[PDB]
Swiss-Prot record, chains A, B:
A GO biological process held by the record: DNA replication
Family note: Belongs to the plasmid replication initiation factor family.
Upper taxonomic lineage: Bacteria, Bacillati, Bacillota, Bacilli, Bacillales
Keyword Heme carried by entry: no
Task performed by this protein: This protein is probably a specific topoisomerase involved in initiating replication. This protein is specifically required and may be rate-limiting for replication of the plasmid in vivo.
Range within the parent protein: 36 to 216 of 311
The name this protein goes by in its record: Replication initiation protein
Note: The nicking site of REP proteins is sequence, but not plasmid, specific.
Organism: Staphylococcus aureus
């Protein structure tokens, strides 16, 4: 099946006037439905819309690193058009120099992705979190502080664990691609380095089968131990087997929704 | 070789008199070499001995929730006996209802553990950090917020990275066992489910067996694919195949030093 694609995180960074800092800082105090803390003249923190939007202004720490001075963080999937409108008009518009610092692509699949893994053509570090059952629930590829980082994890299990409403499907895995800094401008075709795979052996139904192959694939000597009637069974099986690459479906769904997603971005920049 | 064993973290929780709170609060203000903050009559925070001991008193929280009102945190390995003496006499003695809330066992080995297979018989979450190499570097069994949590990792590499004094040995790996809450009283046998092995699948004369193992020891996920009754068969087999199990050396060193360590604890309680 084709995976559903959406943006799942947007950070927007800008710069805010001395005038506007106060103005905005003043505005927000008057609204009890927004929560303010860690206030000074150069600093302000806030969550808005039932805690769905984080907002941080810091002048003293913006300039100390020569950067822009205000972040706004939120998940667009969790905002209602009304809300999106509210946030743009009452916050984003008063920012200048504004662009995207973070942007996350979320591909939901109704298959089981436990055995899938990402590779860039560059050699990267991996982390896998296994459940009590011994199965893998979350996978990290690369590092979170970088232009591109990929999670592959059991959304169903994670939603269940998060006490979210239960879901009709028997399997649900996400592939999140966190694009930061300069990579955000390439979101619309990011897959040149990257492939999301599942091995040869993984595709078999039978644990003993998949072990036996894996061994044959990794220790040449293993053929020498095996009887001829057996050798043929596994020669058959080897040829019968292909590695799977979801990349292609992803690129497809991406292309299919490029224009909507693109508009959905442009919304914030006007 | 036998691994050196030591405690690598202690917290101690207690209650402090109105009289002693002040007495102690008074004492600390006079000493410039201790850093005091967040002070009231019912509150204080402090770091002492060149920032190596954290100390926190809160009465109003303690009254608000029916709890003990003071914690003292430190690593005993990083204290000099002189220092240990100072802390007991000038702080701990003045506590009552005092016991241990955290206790960490650190087994250092001069072998390379990369080449062992580490496993718990118990069903708990595993985290494995893989290197760019594809091989596993660090393993966590359990979660940090729990009665018992285990790290296995390259101490030499971690010490080097930490700009610590270099070490004569070519290899140095730690096995840290963080015991919290009620588990602290069972420090003398907290790792019996844990096994660290060196199996050679080859010596199994049956061939599906050897594949299955080889896979288990090279793809952690494949435990997830085994029904519960099967997992035990292969756990049996693993242990049955390895001449070496470092667990045994740990249990030994532990027994050998149980009495000293025990005294080293009793030191704090008098």
């Amino acid at each position: 099946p084709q995976p559903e694609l959406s943006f799942d995180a947007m950070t927007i960074v800008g710069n805010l006037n001395k005038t506007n800092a106060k103005k905005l800082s003043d505005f927000m105090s008057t609204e009890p439905q927004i929560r303010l803390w860690d206030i000074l003249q150069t600093k302000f923190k806030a969550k808005a819309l039932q805690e769905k939007v984080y907002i941080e202004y810091d002048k003293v720490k913006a300039d100390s690193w020569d950067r822009r001075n205000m972040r706004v963080e939120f998940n667009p999937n969790k905002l209602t058009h009304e809300e999106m409108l509210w946030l743009k008009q009452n916050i984003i518009d008063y920012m200048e120099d504004d662009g995207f610092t973070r942007l996350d692509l979320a591909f939901d699949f109704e298959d089981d992705l436990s055995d899938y893994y990402a590779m860039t053509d560059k050699a990267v570090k991996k982390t896998i979190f296994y459940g009590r059952n011994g199965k893998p629930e979350t996978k990290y590829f690369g590092v979170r502080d970088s232009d591109r980082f990929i999670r592959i994890y059991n959304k169903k299990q994670e939603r269940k664990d998060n006490a979210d409403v239960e879901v009709m499907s028997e399997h649900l895995w996400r592939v999140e691609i966190e694009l930061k800094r300069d990579m955000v401008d390439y979101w619309n075709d990011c897959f040149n380095d990257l492939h999301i795979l599942k091995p040869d052996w993984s595709s078999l139904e039978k644990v003993k089968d998949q072990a036996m192959i894996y061994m044959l694939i990794h220790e040449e000597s293993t053929w020498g131990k095996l009887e001829r009637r057996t050798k043929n069974k596994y020669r058959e099986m080897l040829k019968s087997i292909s590695e799977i690459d979801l990349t292609d479906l992803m690129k497809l769904t991406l292309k299919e929704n490029e224009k909507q997603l693109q508009k959905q971005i442009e919304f914030w920049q006007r």
